[PDB]
Amino acid sequence: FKGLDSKTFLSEHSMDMKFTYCDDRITELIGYHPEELLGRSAYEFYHALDSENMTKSHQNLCTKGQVVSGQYRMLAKHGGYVWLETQGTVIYPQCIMCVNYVLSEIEK
Amino acid sequence: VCQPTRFISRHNIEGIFTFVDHRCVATVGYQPQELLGKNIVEFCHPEDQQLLRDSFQQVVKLKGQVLSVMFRFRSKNQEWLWMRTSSFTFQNPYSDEIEYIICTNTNVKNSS
Numbered sequence: 535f536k537g538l539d540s541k542t543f544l545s546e547h548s549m550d551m552k553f554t555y556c557d558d559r560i561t562e563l564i565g566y567h568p569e570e571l572l573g574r575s576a577y578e579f580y581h582a583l584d585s586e587n588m589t590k591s592h593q594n595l596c597t598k599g600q601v602v603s604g605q606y607r608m609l610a611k612h613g614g615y616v617w618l619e620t621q622g623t624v625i626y627p628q629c630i631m632c633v634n635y636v637l638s639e640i641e642k
Numbered sequence: 643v644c645q646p647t648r649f650i651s652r653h654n655i656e657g658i659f660t661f662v663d664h665r666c667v668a669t670v671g672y673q674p675q676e677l678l679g680k681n682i683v684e685f686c687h688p689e690d691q692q693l694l695r696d697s698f699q700q701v702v703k704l705k706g707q708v709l710s711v712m713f714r715f716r717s718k719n720q721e722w723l724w725m726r727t728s729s730f731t732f733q734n735p736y737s738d739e740i741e742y743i744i745c746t747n748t749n750v751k752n753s754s
Contacts, residue, residue: 628746
């Protein structure tokens with residue numbers, strides 16, 4: 535069992551969803567080192583079944599300035615996926631801030 | 643393009659830094675440990691301190707929207723650098739734990 539903060543990680547992105555920063559909390563949760571995500575688009579890690587929905591959410595974020603994603607699956611470093619949900623916020627555009635909350639253990 | 647110099651921080655609702663992104667070193671010249679546990683207002687120019695306090699107080703009232711503020715931040719070289727801090731609250735609704743404030747702090751120009 536984990537407390538709330540230990541299942542939360544913040545990430546920062548350019549407007550094309552490439553990672554420009556990520557909290558080290560992600561390593562313990564999903565396996566990645568922040569350094570290795572920099573320059574990769576968040577879209578590389580969304581499950582195929584959530585990809586169209588996450589495109590729509592990104593469009594909604596860009597139009598409205600803030601968005602909640604709904605539940606989706608992110609690819610873990612060592613295979614499998616975790617469920618998570620994300621609050622996104624555009625900062626002026628300069629960048630996208632995402633507060634990511636893990637909803638499940640890694641699932642194959 | 644020239645990338646803006648910025649770093650992320652987390653604050654409690656009083657203004658205390660509870661997390662500091664290491665990009666602070668390049669932005670303002672402090673190590674994260676020099677900011678952690680201090681109030682942001684301790685780095686703010688006296689003329690701007692009340693605005694900055696006011697800002698932190700209002701961001702909690704604005705239903706998670708972004709609230710920005712410009713102020714003068716004392717760098718490690720003791721020079722006043724213009725900062726734009728864009729703040730919003732995060733509260734995880736699976737809980738009733740108190741919200742905290744997420745900031746993104748960018749060195750900006752005080753000019754058009």
